[PDB]
Ligand SMILES: C[C@H]1O[C@H](O[C@H]2[C@H](O)[C@@H](O)[C@@H](O[C@H]3[C@H](O)[C@@H](O)[C@@H](O)O[C@@H]3CO)O[C@@H]2CO)[C@H](O)[C@@H](O)[C@@H]1N[C@H]1C=C(CO)[C@@H](O)[C@H](O)[C@H]1O
């Protein structure tokens with residue numbers, strides 16, 4: 001009967017911090033071939049979204065590509081879709097930042113010759129109040145998933161039309177991405193998509209199905225270049241989709257200029273379905289997966305999927321404390337820097353979402369993406385006057401201590417081993433502790449043997465000046481892996497503190513539990529210096545007992561595929577050119593240095609691999625009753 005309207009869109013994005021070859025590959029593998037083929041089919045209509053950095057990379061490297069986009073826009077083949085310039089997850093940044101973020105990209109769209117009216121929701125993380133924000137930015141529609149609607153209570157059958165939604169008395173139009181099309185396109189043969197769309201036709205001329213997904217899926221994703229281009233999937237699809245009398249191709253704006261949204265509906269906090277898995281704590285994510293698989297295993301996932309639920313994106317801040325700290329620190333800086341445009345631009349760049357979470361691969365686990373966020377938090381803050389302060393930054397209920405001078409910002413957590421969790425260099429714009437601890441993930445456990453022997457999961461978070469207590473006969477390999485016997489209770493327990501001039505005095509009354517609790521007291525005087533910091537230690541035991549006290553210092557060493565190593569040293573240097581640079585650790589007394597890379601499990605189609613998140617340096621000093629020494633970190 002009536003034709004079925006079809007909306008085709010792509011979303012192109014490269015997170016800040018990506019290697020140059022990555023942009024080049026995505027452009028050659030996807031961005032360019034895709035538009036060249038679109039140019040060949042005058043009747044094809046595409047709704048495309050480009051992230052700000054991407055458009056900036058293109059203007060600098062591939063200017064001609066922009067002339068092609070202007071042309072296609074001019075011939076009615078492209079509707080430019082926007083969002084937050086630097087791909088922030090809108091719901092996770094200040095409302096003020098949402099405005100400027102979107103307008104920066106609206107300005108760019110405008111320069112391609114198109115007044116953007118729609119927004120691609122980054123990671124489709126929805127919150128009711130985004131309505132107000134999108135509305136203030138002049139946006140008339142946002143792109144979400146069918147799953148957001150199913151979660152609200154509607155059945156898939158009533159999701160082939162866009163809907164209105166309101167908040168604060170403001171209303172905006174919402175289009176749902178048909179999950180099926182995300183799997184049919186472009187991975188399955190063309191006929192599979194044509195058959196599906198044709199079966200959707202009804203007596204309702206306004207019915208519409210929506211496809212909108214990653215542009216990189218058409219060429220970059222493993223295997224897609226061969227399938228989409230070498231084997232002609234795109235050319236065959238564009239020909240089929242434009243030569244079908246039951247399928248009416250149109251852009252989002254064209255649809256709204258002809259059909260009114262079906263009605264009013266309210267959406268919960270959600271994202272696309274797959275995200276319901278990743279955003280759950282590892283244990284629960286595993287259960288979620290078992291549940292989904294067992295439903296499919298009993299051929300009943302299809303009729304019951306509308307009731308399946310999982311986590312929400314913001315909970316990555318719970319799953320990864322390092323992401324939460326990163327996030328809250330940028331929120332802190334965004335506020336203090338809001339009236340300074342030059343400074344503010346840096347904080348807006350720090351809101352690029354990728355490094356804040358982890359799906360099946362990458363994200364927060366890629367040091368280069370993480371350092372880029374930190375790099376920007378630091379550059380924005382550098383415009384502010386240094387000022388020490390006590391406050392609960394990551395909201396765990398126990399204040400942090402921020403000590404800072406003209407060249408550094410150190411964040412101490414008295415509650416957790418009185419350690420330094422953040423040592424940011426204002427000169428290098430690097431956080432020396434921009435590392436991650438080794439954690440189990442629901443998708444772990446197949447993994448090869450060569451890697452299993454190097455796998456280990458931490459019980460300790462990782463910071464700087466982490467006080468240990470091990471047996472003289474303890475081995476590096478036992479320590480490296482988490483097998484060793486930690487005699488003390490100072491690594492993850494609270495420390496008393498006293499503020500001083502340019503630093504803090506920390507001390508803890510604990511004990512060295514071996515054969516009997518032997519009460520101990522660790523003291524550390526941390527003071528910021530112009531090129532780092534210095535810590536004067538004074539360990540004390542209540543009763544004699546041969547042992548080894550160790551001060552651990554984790555470092556965001558990224559470009560140094562370091563390996564386990566133990567050596568004798570009073571002072572040693574570290575040279576990490578592409579990461580934290582050059583630094584020196586000086587002791588006033590020699591010690592046994594234990595070094596090892598922090599390895600994290602990374603899954604790819606090329607099997608399992610390892611990502612070095614940083615390196616741990618532990619300076620061991622023997623102790624029986626009294627121990628006194630000084631450690632100095634120096635930035636070169
Ligand atoms: C992370 C990604 O999730 C969503 O993507 C899903 C695709 O739409 C699905 O079709 C499916 O793709 C798999 C193929 O079916 C399969 O045959 C094989 O080729 O592997 C594909 C990938 O596993 O599953 C995808 C989820 O795994 C979503 O639509 C997409 O926008 C999301 N991409 C964002 C995430 C990151 C990571 O930080 C960014 O690099 C992207 O630019 C974002 O758009």
Ligand SMILES: [Ca+2]
Nearest residue numbers: 392393396398
């Ligand atoms: Ca806290």
